[PDB]
Amino acid sequence: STGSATTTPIDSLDDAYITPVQIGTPAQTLNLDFDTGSSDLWVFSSETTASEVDGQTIYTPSKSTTAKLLSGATWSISYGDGSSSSGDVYTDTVSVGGLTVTGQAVESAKKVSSSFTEDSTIDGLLGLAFSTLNTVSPTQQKTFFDNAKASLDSPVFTADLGYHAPGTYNFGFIDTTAYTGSITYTAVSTKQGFWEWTSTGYAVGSGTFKSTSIDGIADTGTTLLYLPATVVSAYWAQVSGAKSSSSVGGYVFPCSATLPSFTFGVGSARIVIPGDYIDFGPISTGSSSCFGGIQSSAGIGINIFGDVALKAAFVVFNGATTPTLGFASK
């Protein structure tokens, strides 16, 4: 089997991407944030504290003839921004782009933090990291991909995120028309539960390539590109007036700037992030200070190849017995 679904930016900055997901019988379609950096499929639901729901579409298990309470199971998760959610668990039928999994754990939120409530466009998350990170207790649950894998034509999914435009998540096949040149594959460590890999270096603008190993995660659920302070300083030094602002919480730059590109290495191959991808717009409405899309990972504990990086590539998440990652230009 295969599946193919379009993923759409939630706003004009590509702060996140939403993908429609069918849950239950009859189908209830929710728009979920596909997150290769976590491993829980959780939704706003009829059980979510009413004051914490503001415009989201909810899953109502009592209206699904295939929903079953997973008795005793609870979940609770925190994210990279200090946002969180928790609740109980159902199993139900879940379909993405024509690919159906029966008995998928659907984690129903009883509580969500303000950041989730405030974002009307995201109805929940669909985790695509390794199932070892799944938070369901006392019986850990599998991701949608893990459940689908054996049935897929090939045990892979691909992320093809757009810049200020829709893109695609495919399951079970590689669309050879969706990228240019060849796909370069690189080793993955699953030891921390992430799609963790090692970039071979970087360049800033038309500058020379610096060969240096940068361990990090391929994370569709993080907006920005988080890299070591040395690398990030080298980038922003090429932008007149750019500075790190403790008050704002990262590098800012004059909105009048033209940003240089940023290149990262995948083995001997190179992925070029155009400068425009690195602009996250005014820090507050009407400001002439703009927020940077490349930020320091210092104090996170890991480097994160988030949407800024991934959207410059066609990315293969190869879930074969020994997982790997593939990157192609597009």
Residue of 223, 216, 204, 196 lying closest to 281 (CA atoms): 223
SS3 of 202-252: EEECCCCCEEEEEEEEECCCCCCEEECHHHHHHHHCCCCCCEEECCCCEEE
Question: Which of 117, 144, 174 corresponds to the end of one domain?
Answer: 174
Q: Is there a catalytic annotation at residue 199?
A: yes
For residues 47 and 125, what is the distance between their CA atoms, to the nearest angstrom?
16
Residue of 316, 283, 215, 210 lying closest to 293 (CA atoms): 283
**Residues 116, 121, 126, CA angle at the centre, nearest 5°?**
70
Which pair of structure tokens corresponds to residue 131?
């199932």
- Residue 116, SS3 per DSSP: helix
SS3 of 120-161: CCCCEEEECCCHHHCCCECCCCCCHHHHHHHHCCCCEEEEEC
- Based on the domain organization, do 116 and 203 belong to the same domain? no
For residues 237 and 233, what is the distance between their CA atoms, to the nearest angstrom?
6
- Based on the domain organization, do 26 and 126 belong to the same domain? yes
- Based on the domain organization, do 180 and 308 belong to the same domain? yes
For residues 45 and 58, what is the distance between their CA atoms, to the nearest angstrom?
4
On whether the CB atoms of residues 16 and 122 are closer than 8 A, the answer is yes
Round the CA-based radius of gyration of the chain to a whole number and report it: 20
Question: Which of 174, 202, 224 corresponds to the end of one domain?
Answer: 174
42 has which bridge partners?
107, 125
For residues 107 and 46, what is the distance between their CA atoms, to the nearest angstrom?
12
On whether the CB atoms of residues 129 and 323 are closer than 8 A, the answer is no
Active-site residue, from 35, 88, 146, 279: 35
Other C-beta atoms lying within 10 Å of the C-beta of residue 110:
16
Active-site residue, from 85, 199, 261, 296: 199
- Based on the domain organization, do 138 and 181 belong to the same domain? no
- Based on the domain organization, do 193 and 207 belong to the same domain? yes
For residues 274 and 163, what is the distance between their CA atoms, to the nearest angstrom?
10
Q: Is there a catalytic annotation at residue 35?
A: yes
- Based on the domain organization, do 141 and 278 belong to the same domain? no
- Based on the domain organization, do 198 and 283 belong to the same domain? yes
> How big, in percent rounded to 5, are the helix, strand and coil portions of the chain?
10, 45, 45
On whether the CB atoms of residues 94 and 29 are closer than 8 A, the answer is no
Other C-beta atoms lying within 10 Å of the C-beta of residue 304:
24
Residue of 327, 254, 258, 260 lying closest to 291 (CA atoms): 254
Q: Which bin fits 39, alpha (ψ -120 to 50), beta or left (φ > 0)?
A: alpha
Residue with tokens 């109502």: 60
Question: Which of 174, 207, 234 corresponds to the end of one domain?
Answer: 174
- Based on the domain organization, do 211 and 264 belong to the same domain? yes
Residue of 68, 327, 52, 290 lying closest to 180 (CA atoms): 327
Name, in order, each residue with C-beta under 8 angstroms of 145's C-beta and a sequence gap of 6 or more.
Answer: 128, 157, 171, 317, 319
- Expressed as residue numbers, the domain containing 261 is 175-330
Which pair of structure tokens corresponds to residue 107?
């984690």
- Based on the domain organization, do 167 and 236 belong to the same domain? no
**Residues 319, 215, 148, CA angle at the centre, nearest 5°?**
15
DSSP 67: -
- Based on the domain organization, do 229 and 127 belong to the same domain? no
59 has which bridge partners?
45
Structure solved via: X-ray
- DSSP E strand stretches across 28-133: 28-35, 41-43, 68-78, 84-96, 99-112, 124-127
Q: Are strands 184-187 and 28-35 parallel, antiparallel or unpaired?
A: unpaired
Query: What is the distance, to the nearest Å, from the Cα of residue 293 to the centroid of all Cα atoms in its chain?
Result: 15
**Residues 310, 246, 115, CA angle at the centre, nearest 5°?**
60
Segment holding 190, helix H or strand E? none
- Residue 115, SS3 per DSSP: helix
Residue of 234, 176, 232 lying closest to 208 (CA atoms): 234
- Residue 81, SS3 per DSSP: coil
Q: Is the peptide bond before 9 cis (omega within 30 degrees of 0)?
A: no
Amino acid letter, residue 275? G
Residue 308's Cβ-side half-sphere holds a number of Cα atoms within 13 Å equal to: 25
Domain count, the chain: 2
How far apart are the two ends of the chain, measured CA to CA in Å?
25
Residue of 119, 111, 112, 96 lying closest to 15 (CA atoms): 119
For residues 202 and 327, what is the distance between their CA atoms, to the nearest angstrom?
15
Segment holding 191, helix H or strand E? none
For residues 67 and 145, what is the distance between their CA atoms, to the nearest angstrom?
19
